[PDB]
PDB file of C-alpha atoms in Angstrom:
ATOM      1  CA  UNK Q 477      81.445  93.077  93.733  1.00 35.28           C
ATOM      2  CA  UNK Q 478      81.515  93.924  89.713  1.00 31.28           C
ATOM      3  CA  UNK Q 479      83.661  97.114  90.041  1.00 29.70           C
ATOM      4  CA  UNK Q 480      86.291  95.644  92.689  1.00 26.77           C
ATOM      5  CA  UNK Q 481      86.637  92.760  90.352  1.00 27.84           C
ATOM      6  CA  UNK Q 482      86.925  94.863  87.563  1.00 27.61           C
ATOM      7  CA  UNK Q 483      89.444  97.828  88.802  1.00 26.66           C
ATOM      8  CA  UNK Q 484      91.817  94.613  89.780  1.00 27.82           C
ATOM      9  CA  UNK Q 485      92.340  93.077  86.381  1.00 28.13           C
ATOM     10  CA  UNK Q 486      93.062  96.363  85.255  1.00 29.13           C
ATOM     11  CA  UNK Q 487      95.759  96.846  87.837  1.00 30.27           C
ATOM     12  CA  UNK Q 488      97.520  93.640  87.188  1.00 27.41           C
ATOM     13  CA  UNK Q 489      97.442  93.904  82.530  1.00 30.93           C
ATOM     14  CA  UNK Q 490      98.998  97.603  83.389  1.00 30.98           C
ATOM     15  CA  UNK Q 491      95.867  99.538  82.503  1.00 31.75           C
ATOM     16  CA  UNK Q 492      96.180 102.462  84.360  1.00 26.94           C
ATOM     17  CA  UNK Q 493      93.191 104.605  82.659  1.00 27.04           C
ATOM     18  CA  UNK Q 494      90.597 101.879  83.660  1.00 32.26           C
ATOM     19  CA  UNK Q 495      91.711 100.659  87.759  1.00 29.50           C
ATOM     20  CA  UNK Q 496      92.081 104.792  88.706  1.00 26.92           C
ATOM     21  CA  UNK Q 497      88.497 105.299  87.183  1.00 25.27           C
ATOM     22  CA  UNK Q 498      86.801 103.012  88.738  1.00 25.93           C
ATOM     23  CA  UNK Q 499      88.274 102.636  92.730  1.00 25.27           C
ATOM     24  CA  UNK Q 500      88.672 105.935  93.214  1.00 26.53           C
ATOM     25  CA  UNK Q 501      85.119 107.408  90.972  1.00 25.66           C
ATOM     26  CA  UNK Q 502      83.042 104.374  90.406  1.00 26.52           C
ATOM     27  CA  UNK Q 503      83.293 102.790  93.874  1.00 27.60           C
ATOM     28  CA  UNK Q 504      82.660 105.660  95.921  1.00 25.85           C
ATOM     29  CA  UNK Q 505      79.795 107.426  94.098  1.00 25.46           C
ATOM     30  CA  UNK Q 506      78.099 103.912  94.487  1.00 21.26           C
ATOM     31  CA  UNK Q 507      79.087 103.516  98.852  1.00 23.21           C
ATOM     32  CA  UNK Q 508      77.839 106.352  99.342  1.00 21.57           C
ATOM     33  CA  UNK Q 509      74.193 105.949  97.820  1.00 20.96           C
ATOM     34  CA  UNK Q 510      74.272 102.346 100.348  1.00 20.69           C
ATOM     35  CA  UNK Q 511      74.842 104.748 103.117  1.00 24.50           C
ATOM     36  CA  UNK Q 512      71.983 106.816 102.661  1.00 26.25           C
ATOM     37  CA  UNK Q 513      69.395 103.715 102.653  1.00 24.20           C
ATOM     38  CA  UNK Q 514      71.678 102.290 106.063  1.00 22.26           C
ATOM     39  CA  UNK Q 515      70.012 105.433 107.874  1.00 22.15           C
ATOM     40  CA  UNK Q 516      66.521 104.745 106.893  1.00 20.67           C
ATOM     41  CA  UNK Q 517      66.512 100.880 107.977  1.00 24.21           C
ATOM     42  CA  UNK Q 518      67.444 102.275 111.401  1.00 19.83           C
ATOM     43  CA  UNK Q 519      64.933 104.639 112.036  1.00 22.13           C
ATOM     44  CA  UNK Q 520      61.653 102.573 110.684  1.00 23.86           C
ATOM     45  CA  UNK Q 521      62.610  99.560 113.224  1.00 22.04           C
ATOM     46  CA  UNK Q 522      62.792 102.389 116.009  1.00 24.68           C
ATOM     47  CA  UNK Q 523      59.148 103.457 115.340  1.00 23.82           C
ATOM     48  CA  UNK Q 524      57.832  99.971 114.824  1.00 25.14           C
ATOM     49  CA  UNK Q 525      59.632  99.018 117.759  1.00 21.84           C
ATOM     50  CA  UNK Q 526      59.988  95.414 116.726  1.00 20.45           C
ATOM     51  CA  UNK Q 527      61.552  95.139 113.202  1.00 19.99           C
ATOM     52  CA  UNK Q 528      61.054  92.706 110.233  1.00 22.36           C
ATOM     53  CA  UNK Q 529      61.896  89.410 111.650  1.00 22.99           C
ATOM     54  CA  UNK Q 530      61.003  87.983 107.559  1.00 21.11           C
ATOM     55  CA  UNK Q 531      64.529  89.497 106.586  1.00 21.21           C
ATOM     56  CA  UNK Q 532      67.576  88.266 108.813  1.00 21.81           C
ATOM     57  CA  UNK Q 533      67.823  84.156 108.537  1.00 23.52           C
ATOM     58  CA  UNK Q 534      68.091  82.593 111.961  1.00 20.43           C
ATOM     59  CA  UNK Q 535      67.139  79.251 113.504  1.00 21.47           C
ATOM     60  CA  UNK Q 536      63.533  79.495 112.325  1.00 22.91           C
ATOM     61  CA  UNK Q 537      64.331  79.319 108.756  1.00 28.01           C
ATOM     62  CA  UNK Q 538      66.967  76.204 109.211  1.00 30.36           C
ATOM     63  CA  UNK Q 539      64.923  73.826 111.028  1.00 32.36           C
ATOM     64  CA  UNK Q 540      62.146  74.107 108.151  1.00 32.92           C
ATOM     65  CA  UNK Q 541      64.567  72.710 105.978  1.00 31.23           C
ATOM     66  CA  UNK Q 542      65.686  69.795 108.110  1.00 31.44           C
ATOM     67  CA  UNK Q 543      61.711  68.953 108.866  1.00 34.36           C
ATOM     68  CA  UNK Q 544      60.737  68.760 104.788  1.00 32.91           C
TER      69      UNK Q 544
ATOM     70  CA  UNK M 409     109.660  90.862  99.056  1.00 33.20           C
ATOM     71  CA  UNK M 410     106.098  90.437  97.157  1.00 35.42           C
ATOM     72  CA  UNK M 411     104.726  92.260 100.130  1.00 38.59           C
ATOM     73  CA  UNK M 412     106.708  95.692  98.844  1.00 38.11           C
ATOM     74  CA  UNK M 413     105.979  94.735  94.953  1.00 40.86           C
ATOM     75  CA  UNK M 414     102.269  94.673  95.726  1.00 43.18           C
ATOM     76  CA  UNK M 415     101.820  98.047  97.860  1.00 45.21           C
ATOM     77  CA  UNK M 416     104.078  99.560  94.664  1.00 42.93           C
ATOM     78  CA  UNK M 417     101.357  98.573  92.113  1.00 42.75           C
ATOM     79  CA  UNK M 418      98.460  99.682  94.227  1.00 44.02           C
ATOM     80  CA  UNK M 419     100.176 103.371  94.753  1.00 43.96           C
ATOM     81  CA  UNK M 420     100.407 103.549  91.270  1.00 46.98           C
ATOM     82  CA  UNK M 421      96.622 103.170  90.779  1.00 47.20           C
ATOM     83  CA  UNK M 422      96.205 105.761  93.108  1.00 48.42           C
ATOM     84  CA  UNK M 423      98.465 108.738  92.042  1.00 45.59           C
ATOM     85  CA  UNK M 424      97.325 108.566  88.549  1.00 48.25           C
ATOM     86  CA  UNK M 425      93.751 109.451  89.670  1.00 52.31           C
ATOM     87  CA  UNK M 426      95.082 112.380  91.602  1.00 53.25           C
ATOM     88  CA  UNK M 427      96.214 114.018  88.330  1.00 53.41           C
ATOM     89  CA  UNK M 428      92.905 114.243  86.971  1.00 52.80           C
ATOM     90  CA  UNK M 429      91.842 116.474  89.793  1.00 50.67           C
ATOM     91  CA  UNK M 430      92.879 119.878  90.067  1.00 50.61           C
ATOM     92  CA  UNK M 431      92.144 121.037  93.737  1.00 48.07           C
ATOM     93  CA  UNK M 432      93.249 121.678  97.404  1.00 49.65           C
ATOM     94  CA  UNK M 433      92.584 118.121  98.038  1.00 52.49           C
ATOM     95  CA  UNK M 434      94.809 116.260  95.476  1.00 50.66           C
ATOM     96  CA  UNK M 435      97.876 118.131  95.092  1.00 46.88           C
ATOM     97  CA  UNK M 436      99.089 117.609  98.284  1.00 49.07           C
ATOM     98  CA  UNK M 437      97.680 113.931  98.828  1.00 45.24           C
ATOM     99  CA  UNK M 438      99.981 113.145  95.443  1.00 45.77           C
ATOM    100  CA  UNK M 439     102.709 114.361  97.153  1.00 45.50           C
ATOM    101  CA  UNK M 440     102.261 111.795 100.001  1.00 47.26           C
ATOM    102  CA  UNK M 441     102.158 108.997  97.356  1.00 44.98           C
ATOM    103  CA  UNK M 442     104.966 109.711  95.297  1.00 46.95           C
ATOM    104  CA  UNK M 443     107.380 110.393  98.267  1.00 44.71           C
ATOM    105  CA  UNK M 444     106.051 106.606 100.233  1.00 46.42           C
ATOM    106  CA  UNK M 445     107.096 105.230  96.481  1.00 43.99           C
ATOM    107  CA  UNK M 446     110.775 106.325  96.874  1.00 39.96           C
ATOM    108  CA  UNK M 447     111.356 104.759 100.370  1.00 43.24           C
ATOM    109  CA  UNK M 448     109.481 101.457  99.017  1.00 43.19           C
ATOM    110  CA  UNK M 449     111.993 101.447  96.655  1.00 45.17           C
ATOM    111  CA  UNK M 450     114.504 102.115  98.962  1.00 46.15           C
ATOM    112  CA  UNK M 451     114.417  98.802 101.040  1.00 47.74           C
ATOM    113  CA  UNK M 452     113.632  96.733  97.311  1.00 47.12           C
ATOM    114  CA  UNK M 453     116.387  97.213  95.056  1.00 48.99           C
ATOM    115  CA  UNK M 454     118.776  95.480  97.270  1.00 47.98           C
ATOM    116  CA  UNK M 455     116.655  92.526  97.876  1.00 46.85           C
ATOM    117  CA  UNK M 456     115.250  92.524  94.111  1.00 46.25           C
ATOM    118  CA  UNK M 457     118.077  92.424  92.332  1.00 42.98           C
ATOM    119  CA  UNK M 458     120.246  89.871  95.024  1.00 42.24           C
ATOM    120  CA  UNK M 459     117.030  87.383  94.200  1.00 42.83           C
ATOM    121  CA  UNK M 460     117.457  87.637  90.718  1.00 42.47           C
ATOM    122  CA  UNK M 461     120.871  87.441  90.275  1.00 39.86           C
ATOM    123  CA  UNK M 462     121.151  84.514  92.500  1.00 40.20           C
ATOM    124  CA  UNK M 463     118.133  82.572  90.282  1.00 39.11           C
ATOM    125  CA  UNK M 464     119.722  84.388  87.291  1.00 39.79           C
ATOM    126  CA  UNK M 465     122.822  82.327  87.668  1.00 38.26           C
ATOM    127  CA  UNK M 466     121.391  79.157  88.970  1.00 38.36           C
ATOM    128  CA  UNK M 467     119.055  78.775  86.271  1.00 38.46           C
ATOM    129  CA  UNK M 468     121.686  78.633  83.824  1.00 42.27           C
ATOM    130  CA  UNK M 469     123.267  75.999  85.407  1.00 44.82           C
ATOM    131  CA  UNK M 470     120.648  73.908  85.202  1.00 43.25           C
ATOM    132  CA  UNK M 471     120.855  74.077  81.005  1.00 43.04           C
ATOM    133  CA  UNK M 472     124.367  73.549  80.782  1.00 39.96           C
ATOM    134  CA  UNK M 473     123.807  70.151  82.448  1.00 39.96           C
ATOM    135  CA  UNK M 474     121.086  68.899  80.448  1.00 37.06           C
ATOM    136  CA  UNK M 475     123.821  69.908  77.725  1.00 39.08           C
ATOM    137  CA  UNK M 476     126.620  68.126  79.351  1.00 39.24           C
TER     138      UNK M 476
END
């Protein structure tokens, strides 16, 4: 969220050397090291065979709130 | 007409990080960019310069009354 904010202020003070730099080098050399941990999520909840259900906030963590 | 002023600024971005790169990869993407800049262009100048002449004139009109 840094380097999109970043590469656009560049874009719009006509900076050239510093948007280029950053959409096109900085953001993908950093997507592609999120892809790699994507891959391993999947495959531990397919040999548990139930997940973490202490990660994704559903109903059970909004009516504790409401009870305090 | 800011639809074709914004997709002009973000091609420019683009095409000047494709001259860094000296491959089979960016010397025919660069090709692509600078050739979708000329028909952008195209379909702008007579729609660019008919909005500013027409605020170009009325504008002035406006100080010679406060003159008046």
């Amino acid at each position: 969220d840094e380097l999109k904010a970043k590469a656009e202020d560049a874009e719009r003070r006509y900076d050239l050397a510093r948007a280029a730099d950053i959409r096109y080098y900085a953001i993908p050399d950093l997507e592609k090291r999120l892809a790699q941990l994507q891959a391993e999520k999947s495959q531990a909840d397919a040999e548990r065979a139930d997940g973490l259900l202490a990660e994704v906030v559903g109903p059970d963590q909004i009516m504790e709130v409401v009870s305090r | 007409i800011d639809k074709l002023e914004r997709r002009h600024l973000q091609l420019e971005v683009e095409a000047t990080a494709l001259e860094k790169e000296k491959d089979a990869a960016s010397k025919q993407r660069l090709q692509e960019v600078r050739a979708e800049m000329a028909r952008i262009q195209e379909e702008l100048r007579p729609l660019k310069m008919k909005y500013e002449s027409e605020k170009g004139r009325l504008d002035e009109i406006r100080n010679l009354s406060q003159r008046l």
